[PDB]
Amino acid sequence: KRVGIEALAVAVPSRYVDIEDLARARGVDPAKYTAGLGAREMAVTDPGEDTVALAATAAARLIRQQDVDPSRIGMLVVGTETGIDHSKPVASHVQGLLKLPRTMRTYDTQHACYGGTAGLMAAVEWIASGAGAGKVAVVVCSDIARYGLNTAGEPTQGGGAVALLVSEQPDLLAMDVGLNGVCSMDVYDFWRPVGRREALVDGHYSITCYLEALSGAYRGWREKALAAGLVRWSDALPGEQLARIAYHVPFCKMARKAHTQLRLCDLEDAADAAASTPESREAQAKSAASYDAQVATSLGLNSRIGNVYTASLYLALAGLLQHEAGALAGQRIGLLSYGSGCAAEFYSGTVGEKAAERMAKADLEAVLARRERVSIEEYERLMKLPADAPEAVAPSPGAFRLTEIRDHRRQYAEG
Amino acid sequence: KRVGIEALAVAVPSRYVDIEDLARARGVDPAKYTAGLGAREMAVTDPGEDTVALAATAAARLIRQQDVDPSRIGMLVVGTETGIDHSKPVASHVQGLLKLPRTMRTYDTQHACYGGTAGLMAAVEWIASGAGAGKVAVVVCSDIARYGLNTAGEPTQGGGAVALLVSEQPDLLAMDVGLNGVCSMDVYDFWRPVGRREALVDGHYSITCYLEALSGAYRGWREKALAAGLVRWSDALPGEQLARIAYHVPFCKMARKAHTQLRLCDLEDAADAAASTPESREAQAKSAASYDAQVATSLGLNSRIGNVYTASLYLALAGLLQHEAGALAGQRIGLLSYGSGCAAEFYSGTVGEKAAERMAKADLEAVLARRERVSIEEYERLMKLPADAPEAVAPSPGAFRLTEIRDHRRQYAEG
Ligand SMILES: CC(C)(COP(=O)(O)OP(=O)(O)OC[C@H]1O[C@@H](n2cnc3c(N)ncnc32)[C@H](O)[C@@H]1OP(=O)(O)O)[C@@H](O)C(=O)NCCC(=O)NCCS
Ligand SMILES: CC(C)(COP(=O)(O)OP(=O)(O)OC[C@H]1O[C@@H](n2cnc3c(N)ncnc32)[C@H](O)[C@@H]1OP(=O)(O)O)[C@@H](O)C(=O)NCCC(=O)NCCS
């Protein structure tokens, strides 16, 4: 008996900008974004590419690529911090756009960039409890990250959606139920009050909160993983025994910071830690070999899209399995989800034999291939457009766009 | 092995108005609100009684009244359609105000008035999956219903919060896991776009959607309950074999409509339905005897508070068990949750032997006793106050209020 992620699909906005064009535009050394942050291309949106449209594009693509029977979906959850109504959830819009049947729970989950994982766990545990046996769930992480012109967070902006298929046939990731570690605390590192279109953030403080919550979540998982015989204090650090580790990527260089911190948790908690110094522990924790073996190949997609909040971690999982699904089959990997506010959860799972099949059907290269580069000038023009003023452009085949808001009702079109 | 609701607590705003004062103020026949809608008293708020403050008051009261060990809480979820941030969830605020520890998931669930049930099921199935074994969850339904001055929905306004304790010791309601019926569809019956403080609603269309979604959800549950031997087609209709049925109460008279519809589902689907007429089926479905035996005693609290969206159904459960917990111990009851947008879920559970104990510790009479009546004139003045302008009044002991918003950070005080 297994449960977890069976397949995934992703949707991206139709436009992007080269990150070095953004630096030049802002009077910033390009190397700060490319080397300092690890960014290559930044997704940019117009009002037509809203949370619903992206979420529905991704979920409709999942059902098509993986040949999902819509009537087997018992749960449709949208994790997002870019909601479009205080009451009506994006999930209900997605249900209608996809013409899905009625025998399913629909709702949205919210906690910054952790909201997707929260919905994933609710779907997993709905199945694992037996309530969802014989059925599947679809959990969509959909967000548009917006910090504003001339802000420190601008180069980490992005947008898109990742639709996750959750079932008793977890071809991508059979998750280890009950082993999750979690760490949460009331903080103001990043937030976006109602009515404000741009987020508020204490940049370097959100990094500290990330690493603090990460440490607690990983340690919680490690304890449970030790008792279940999945890892051990041996010649290898417990975290080294995971084939790969994927982290929430607000920006690509954040994955190296997170991996260093995770390994420090092992080195500081090792029974022989007294024999080491902070200098020796940091040099070992920063091991380039460990980062290359465990993390480096998970950032290909994230570097060309930017921050997608709830979807960043699962874009990393996607980048990782896009190329290494076959090699990772039967191997256990770890995932760290973070949400400003804040909450972190660290969980593990085993990649399935059929993972390569499911990722090939996701055809991620073709998803990224359909985008077009625009100028910073055009990016800014689209940014200033009001949320109810989509561009008069058609969606791609099978994709969705917002067309207008009439009498407070949102209208959408399918390509 | 059992799982469900162990205990509950409720918080109410400090003010209310007599509903007949509202009618007189609006040039409406008082009997329309009292007889037509079933309302007695309508809760009213000032900006200090926001979603966080009400949610934190209820959850803090739960922990105190039921002597909960905060470090056993592994999940804290807030169901609400009155969010105060696009990113930071009410749950994270509640965590900080209550000074809870860190080993717990926090997030908000959204789907109109169904959002609390969604979070409840996520907590239940987290435990039932084994992931939450040995721990408890707290699910808070917190909302302020606001339609605006001189609107058709104004007399159904309200506010408050119900905090639910979810554990493997479901003293109030050991829920039948896996038997839920559910029915959802993309509709615009009721919604509230971002930035709009008052809800939009097609009144009588939301009633139809309620009854349509109810019918599907109940039928789904009934099918599963028939196969599990919990109900049977006998001299009694399947729905009659439930000791009680609690429904989402947007207004009190809505419970009679819902109960009539539920019974019609039985009468229309009965193998001998061909021998009946619509006239005979409606007269039997409207049975006053059945409504009095199954539903009537669940509306005492709702009638003095008004619509609390996510919390209305569980205020009904509270009113029911407040007086009949002892008699209902060992008996199975049904619950219907509705959320505009829309989604309905019907589920069942068995009242526990210790339910009367837990309800006595909730001391609901004293909760309602602390309120004060105000004038419609004062109600309107408080209504026009901006969300960031709380009244300079102290919270009650153990309760919380919003005090101000400084530099986009919300500040709260504990009484
Ligand atoms: C991430 C963020 C905090 C950084 O912005 P900043 O404060 O303007 O950038 P910094 O001053 O920290 O510079 C970033 C890095 O690039 C480096 N850098 C700067 N100029 C450089 C250059 N010319 N060549 C190479 N590297 C350079 C810096 O040394 C720094 O390195 P380090 O991380 O290894 O120390 C900001 O983009 C932000 O707030 N983002 C939004 C929130 C977020 O994503 N938070 C993450 C946690 S969830
Ligand atoms: C509920 C709501 C639709 C009713 O408002 P309304 O349209 O102004 O009221 P109606 O015209 O339907 O009148 C309501 C009832 O009171 C009765 N009534 C009116 N005047 C009366 C009087 N003087 N004496 C006795 N009864 C009276 C009506 O006959 C009607 O009865 P019925 O329900 O049994 O048919 C409105 O309050 C609303 O939109 N509420 C918000 C959304 C909501 O709660 N929806 C519920 C589904 S979630």
PDB file of N, CA, C and O and ligand atoms in Angstrom, chain A residues 29-33 35-37 113 147 152-156 189-190 201-204 206-207 210 248 250-251 253-254 257 307 338 340, ligand 1:
ATOM      1  N   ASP A  29      24.333  45.601 -11.202  1.00  0.00           N
ATOM      2  CA  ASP A  29      25.300  44.719 -11.837  1.00  0.00           C
ATOM      3  C   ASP A  29      24.611  43.413 -12.222  1.00  0.00           C
ATOM      4  O   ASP A  29      24.084  42.720 -11.337  1.00  0.00           O
ATOM      5  N   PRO A  30      24.576  43.043 -13.507  1.00  0.00           N
ATOM      6  CA  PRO A  30      23.903  41.789 -13.889  1.00  0.00           C
ATOM      7  C   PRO A  30      24.339  40.582 -13.078  1.00  0.00           C
ATOM      8  O   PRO A  30      23.514  39.704 -12.794  1.00  0.00           O
ATOM      9  N   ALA A  31      25.617  40.510 -12.697  1.00  0.00           N
ATOM     10  CA  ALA A  31      26.112  39.350 -11.966  1.00  0.00           C
ATOM     11  C   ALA A  31      25.414  39.169 -10.624  1.00  0.00           C
ATOM     12  O   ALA A  31      25.429  38.060 -10.080  1.00  0.00           O
ATOM     13  N   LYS A  32      24.807  40.224 -10.074  1.00  0.00           N
ATOM     14  CA  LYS A  32      24.081  40.068  -8.817  1.00  0.00           C
ATOM     15  C   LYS A  32      22.890  39.134  -8.988  1.00  0.00           C
ATOM     16  O   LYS A  32      22.626  38.287  -8.128  1.00  0.00           O
ATOM     17  N   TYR A  33      22.157  39.276 -10.092  1.00  0.00           N
ATOM     18  CA  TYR A  33      21.002  38.415 -10.325  1.00  0.00           C
ATOM     19  C   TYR A  33      21.423  37.036 -10.818  1.00  0.00           C
ATOM     20  O   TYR A  33      20.854  36.025 -10.391  1.00  0.00           O
ATOM     21  N   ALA A  35      24.668  35.437 -10.763  1.00  0.00           N
ATOM     22  CA  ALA A  35      25.509  34.718  -9.815  1.00  0.00           C
ATOM     23  C   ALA A  35      24.984  34.841  -8.389  1.00  0.00           C
ATOM     24  O   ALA A  35      24.899  33.842  -7.667  1.00  0.00           O
ATOM     25  N   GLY A  36      24.628  36.057  -7.976  1.00  0.00           N
ATOM     26  CA  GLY A  36      24.190  36.265  -6.608  1.00  0.00           C
ATOM     27  C   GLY A  36      22.887  35.558  -6.291  1.00  0.00           C
ATOM     28  O   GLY A  36      22.732  34.982  -5.210  1.00  0.00           O
ATOM     29  N   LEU A  37      21.932  35.592  -7.223  1.00  0.00           N
ATOM     30  CA  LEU A  37      20.631  34.972  -7.019  1.00  0.00           C
ATOM     31  C   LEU A  37      20.434  33.683  -7.803  1.00  0.00           C
ATOM     32  O   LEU A  37      19.570  32.883  -7.428  1.00  0.00           O
ATOM     33  N   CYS A 113       3.977  30.413   0.716  1.00  0.00           N
ATOM     34  CA  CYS A 113       4.498  29.436  -0.232  1.00  0.00           C
ATOM     35  C   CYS A 113       4.425  27.993   0.293  1.00  0.00           C
ATOM     36  O   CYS A 113       4.983  27.069  -0.355  1.00  0.00           O
ATOM     37  N   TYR A 147       6.413  41.841  -6.431  1.00  0.00           N
ATOM     38  CA  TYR A 147       6.994  42.719  -5.424  1.00  0.00           C
ATOM     39  C   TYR A 147       6.961  44.189  -5.810  1.00  0.00           C
ATOM     40  O   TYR A 147       6.914  45.041  -4.923  1.00  0.00           O
ATOM     41  N   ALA A 152      13.567  45.376  -3.853  1.00  0.00           N
ATOM     42  CA  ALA A 152      14.600  44.356  -3.710  1.00  0.00           C
ATOM     43  C   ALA A 152      14.103  42.989  -4.154  1.00  0.00           C
ATOM     44  O   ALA A 152      14.892  42.168  -4.635  1.00  0.00           O
ATOM     45  N   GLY A 153      12.806  42.723  -4.003  1.00  0.00           N
ATOM     46  CA  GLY A 153      12.246  41.443  -4.388  1.00  0.00           C
ATOM     47  C   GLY A 153      11.908  41.301  -5.854  1.00  0.00           C
ATOM     48  O   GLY A 153      11.612  40.187  -6.296  1.00  0.00           O
ATOM     49  N   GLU A 154      11.948  42.395  -6.614  1.00  0.00           N
ATOM     50  CA  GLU A 154      11.568  42.349  -8.025  1.00  0.00           C
ATOM     51  C   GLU A 154      12.277  41.252  -8.809  1.00  0.00           C
ATOM     52  O   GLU A 154      11.601  40.534  -9.563  1.00  0.00           O
ATOM     53  N   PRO A 155      13.597  41.060  -8.697  1.00  0.00           N
ATOM     54  CA  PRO A 155      14.253  40.030  -9.518  1.00  0.00           C
ATOM     55  C   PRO A 155      13.887  38.603  -9.141  1.00  0.00           C
ATOM     56  O   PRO A 155      14.235  37.683  -9.894  1.00  0.00           O
ATOM     57  N   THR A 156      13.212  38.381  -8.013  1.00  0.00           N
ATOM     58  CA  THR A 156      12.741  37.054  -7.638  1.00  0.00           C
ATOM     59  C   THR A 156      11.274  36.836  -7.993  1.00  0.00           C
ATOM     60  O   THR A 156      10.680  35.848  -7.552  1.00  0.00           O
ATOM     61  N   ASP A 189       7.778  38.026   8.296  1.00  0.00           N
ATOM     62  CA  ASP A 189       8.912  38.095   7.382  1.00  0.00           C
ATOM     63  C   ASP A 189       8.463  38.513   5.988  1.00  0.00           C
ATOM     64  O   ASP A 189       9.181  39.242   5.293  1.00  0.00           O
ATOM     65  N   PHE A 190       7.277  38.070   5.577  1.00  0.00           N
ATOM     66  CA  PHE A 190       6.736  38.343   4.252  1.00  0.00           C
ATOM     67  C   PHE A 190       5.223  38.260   4.360  1.00  0.00           C
ATOM     68  O   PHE A 190       4.697  37.309   4.946  1.00  0.00           O
ATOM     69  N   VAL A 201       7.966  42.612   2.562  1.00  0.00           N
ATOM     70  CA  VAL A 201       8.969  41.613   2.907  1.00  0.00           C
ATOM     71  C   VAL A 201      10.136  42.289   3.612  1.00  0.00           C
ATOM     72  O   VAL A 201      10.589  43.365   3.214  1.00  0.00           O
ATOM     73  N   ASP A 202      10.619  41.636   4.668  1.00  0.00           N
ATOM     74  CA  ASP A 202      11.908  41.948   5.284  1.00  0.00           C
ATOM     75  C   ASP A 202      12.885  40.904   4.748  1.00  0.00           C
ATOM     76  O   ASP A 202      13.056  39.830   5.323  1.00  0.00           O
ATOM     77  N   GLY A 203      13.527  41.237   3.628  1.00  0.00           N
ATOM     78  CA  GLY A 203      14.277  40.280   2.832  1.00  0.00           C
ATOM     79  C   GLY A 203      15.176  39.327   3.593  1.00  0.00           C
ATOM     80  O   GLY A 203      14.938  38.115   3.598  1.00  0.00           O
ATOM     81  N   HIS A 204      16.224  39.856   4.229  1.00  0.00           N
ATOM     82  CA  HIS A 204      17.179  38.992   4.912  1.00  0.00           C
ATOM     83  C   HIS A 204      16.588  38.351   6.158  1.00  0.00           C
ATOM     84  O   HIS A 204      17.079  37.306   6.593  1.00  0.00           O
ATOM     85  N   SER A 206      13.474  37.164   6.181  1.00  0.00           N
ATOM     86  CA  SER A 206      12.767  36.001   5.656  1.00  0.00           C
ATOM     87  C   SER A 206      13.723  34.847   5.384  1.00  0.00           C
ATOM     88  O   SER A 206      13.330  33.681   5.493  1.00  0.00           O
ATOM     89  N   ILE A 207      14.971  35.150   5.031  1.00  0.00           N
ATOM     90  CA  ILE A 207      15.972  34.102   4.857  1.00  0.00           C
ATOM     91  C   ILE A 207      16.253  33.416   6.188  1.00  0.00           C
ATOM     92  O   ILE A 207      16.308  32.184   6.271  1.00  0.00           O
ATOM     93  N   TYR A 210      13.334  31.287   7.126  1.00  0.00           N
ATOM     94  CA  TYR A 210      13.406  30.087   6.297  1.00  0.00           C
ATOM     95  C   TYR A 210      14.339  29.055   6.920  1.00  0.00           C
ATOM     96  O   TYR A 210      13.954  27.900   7.137  1.00  0.00           O
ATOM     97  N   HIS A 248      12.162  24.510  -1.206  1.00  0.00           N
ATOM     98  CA  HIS A 248      11.435  25.664  -1.713  1.00  0.00           C
ATOM     99  C   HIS A 248      12.422  26.696  -2.243  1.00  0.00           C
ATOM    100  O   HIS A 248      13.337  27.121  -1.533  1.00  0.00           O
ATOM    101  N   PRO A 250      12.694  30.297  -3.393  1.00  0.00           N
ATOM    102  CA  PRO A 250      12.344  31.693  -3.689  1.00  0.00           C
ATOM    103  C   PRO A 250      13.290  32.306  -4.701  1.00  0.00           C
ATOM    104  O   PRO A 250      12.873  33.140  -5.513  1.00  0.00           O
ATOM    105  N   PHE A 251      14.560  31.913  -4.653  1.00  0.00           N
ATOM    106  CA  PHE A 251      15.534  32.177  -5.697  1.00  0.00           C
ATOM    107  C   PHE A 251      16.529  31.026  -5.662  1.00  0.00           C
ATOM    108  O   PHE A 251      16.678  30.348  -4.643  1.00  0.00           O
ATOM    109  N   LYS A 253      19.766  30.467  -5.640  1.00  0.00           N
ATOM    110  CA  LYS A 253      20.860  30.375  -4.680  1.00  0.00           C
ATOM    111  C   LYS A 253      20.368  30.027  -3.282  1.00  0.00           C
ATOM    112  O   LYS A 253      21.166  29.585  -2.449  1.00  0.00           O
ATOM    113  N   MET A 254      19.074  30.208  -3.009  1.00  0.00           N
ATOM    114  CA  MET A 254      18.523  29.834  -1.713  1.00  0.00           C
ATOM    115  C   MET A 254      18.644  28.340  -1.450  1.00  0.00           C
ATOM    116  O   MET A 254      18.629  27.926  -0.286  1.00  0.00           O
ATOM    117  N   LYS A 257      22.004  27.704   0.366  1.00  0.00           N
ATOM    118  CA  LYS A 257      21.881  28.093   1.768  1.00  0.00           C
ATOM    119  C   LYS A 257      21.117  27.038   2.555  1.00  0.00           C
ATOM    120  O   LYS A 257      21.538  26.624   3.640  1.00  0.00           O
ATOM    121  N   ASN A 307      10.250  32.855  -8.731  1.00  0.00           N
ATOM    122  CA  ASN A 307       9.459  32.399  -7.596  1.00  0.00           C
ATOM    123  C   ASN A 307       8.004  32.209  -8.011  1.00  0.00           C
ATOM    124  O   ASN A 307       7.388  33.112  -8.587  1.00  0.00           O
ATOM    125  N   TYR A 338       8.591  25.506   2.593  1.00  0.00           N
ATOM    126  CA  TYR A 338       8.548  26.648   3.490  1.00  0.00           C
ATOM    127  C   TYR A 338       7.427  27.591   3.083  1.00  0.00           C
ATOM    128  O   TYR A 338       7.125  27.758   1.896  1.00  0.00           O
ATOM    129  N   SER A 340       6.303  31.612   4.300  1.00  0.00           N
ATOM    130  CA  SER A 340       6.458  32.774   5.162  1.00  0.00           C
ATOM    131  C   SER A 340       5.212  32.944   6.020  1.00  0.00           C
ATOM    132  O   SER A 340       4.094  32.667   5.578  1.00  0.00           O
TER     133      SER A 340
HETATM  134  C1  LIG C   1      16.611  37.839  -1.836  1.00  0.00           C
HETATM  135  C2  LIG C   1      16.723  39.267  -1.469  1.00  0.00           C
HETATM  136  C3  LIG C   1      16.590  39.339   0.015  1.00  0.00           C
HETATM  137  C4  LIG C   1      18.087  39.788  -1.865  1.00  0.00           C
HETATM  138  O1  LIG C   1      18.089  41.131  -2.216  1.00  0.00           O
HETATM  139  P1  LIG C   1      19.238  42.069  -1.874  1.00  0.00           P
HETATM  140  O2  LIG C   1      19.068  42.250  -0.456  1.00  0.00           O
HETATM  141  O3  LIG C   1      18.941  43.154  -2.721  1.00  0.00           O
HETATM  142  O4  LIG C   1      20.514  41.285  -2.239  1.00  0.00           O
HETATM  143  P2  LIG C   1      21.780  40.988  -1.371  1.00  0.00           P
HETATM  144  O5  LIG C   1      22.267  42.254  -0.930  1.00  0.00           O
HETATM  145  O6  LIG C   1      21.535  40.049  -0.363  1.00  0.00           O
HETATM  146  O7  LIG C   1      22.625  40.248  -2.477  1.00  0.00           O
HETATM  147  C5  LIG C   1      22.402  38.885  -2.842  1.00  0.00           C
HETATM  148  C6  LIG C   1      23.651  38.079  -3.167  1.00  0.00           C
HETATM  149  O8  LIG C   1      24.246  38.421  -4.429  1.00  0.00           O
HETATM  150  C7  LIG C   1      25.581  38.828  -4.236  1.00  0.00           C
HETATM  151  N1  LIG C   1      26.014  39.853  -5.169  1.00  0.00           N
HETATM  152  C8  LIG C   1      25.701  41.118  -5.214  1.00  0.00           C
HETATM  153  N2  LIG C   1      26.329  41.672  -6.193  1.00  0.00           N
HETATM  154  C9  LIG C   1      27.063  40.802  -6.818  1.00  0.00           C
HETATM  155  C10 LIG C   1      27.983  40.785  -7.960  1.00  0.00           C
HETATM  156  N3  LIG C   1      28.238  41.874  -8.648  1.00  0.00           N
HETATM  157  N4  LIG C   1      28.535  39.637  -8.268  1.00  0.00           N
HETATM  158  C11 LIG C   1      28.303  38.555  -7.593  1.00  0.00           C
HETATM  159  N5  LIG C   1      27.487  38.488  -6.551  1.00  0.00           N
HETATM  160  C12 LIG C   1      26.860  39.569  -6.132  1.00  0.00           C
HETATM  161  C13 LIG C   1      25.648  39.198  -2.757  1.00  0.00           C
HETATM  162  O9  LIG C   1      26.899  39.158  -2.184  1.00  0.00           O
HETATM  163  C14 LIG C   1      24.688  38.235  -2.092  1.00  0.00           C
HETATM  164  O10 LIG C   1      25.315  37.005  -1.804  1.00  0.00           O
HETATM  165  P3  LIG C   1      25.093  35.906  -0.750  1.00  0.00           P
HETATM  166  O11 LIG C   1      23.747  35.548  -0.755  1.00  0.00           O
HETATM  167  O12 LIG C   1      25.826  34.776  -1.164  1.00  0.00           O
HETATM  168  O13 LIG C   1      25.517  36.545   0.427  1.00  0.00           O
HETATM  169  C15 LIG C   1      15.585  40.042  -2.137  1.00  0.00           C
HETATM  170  O14 LIG C   1      15.589  39.733  -3.471  1.00  0.00           O
HETATM  171  C16 LIG C   1      14.230  39.728  -1.545  1.00  0.00           C
HETATM  172  O15 LIG C   1      13.849  40.273  -0.580  1.00  0.00           O
HETATM  173  N6  LIG C   1      13.479  38.836  -2.127  1.00  0.00           N
HETATM  174  C17 LIG C   1      12.117  38.505  -1.778  1.00  0.00           C
HETATM  175  C18 LIG C   1      11.847  37.539  -0.645  1.00  0.00           C
HETATM  176  C19 LIG C   1      12.575  36.207  -0.749  1.00  0.00           C
HETATM  177  O16 LIG C   1      12.694  35.631  -1.772  1.00  0.00           O
HETATM  178  N7  LIG C   1      13.048  35.682   0.356  1.00  0.00           N
HETATM  179  C20 LIG C   1      13.672  34.411   0.423  1.00  0.00           C
HETATM  180  C21 LIG C   1      13.293  33.625   1.620  1.00  0.00           C
HETATM  181  S1  LIG C   1      11.631  32.993   1.407  1.00  0.00           S
END
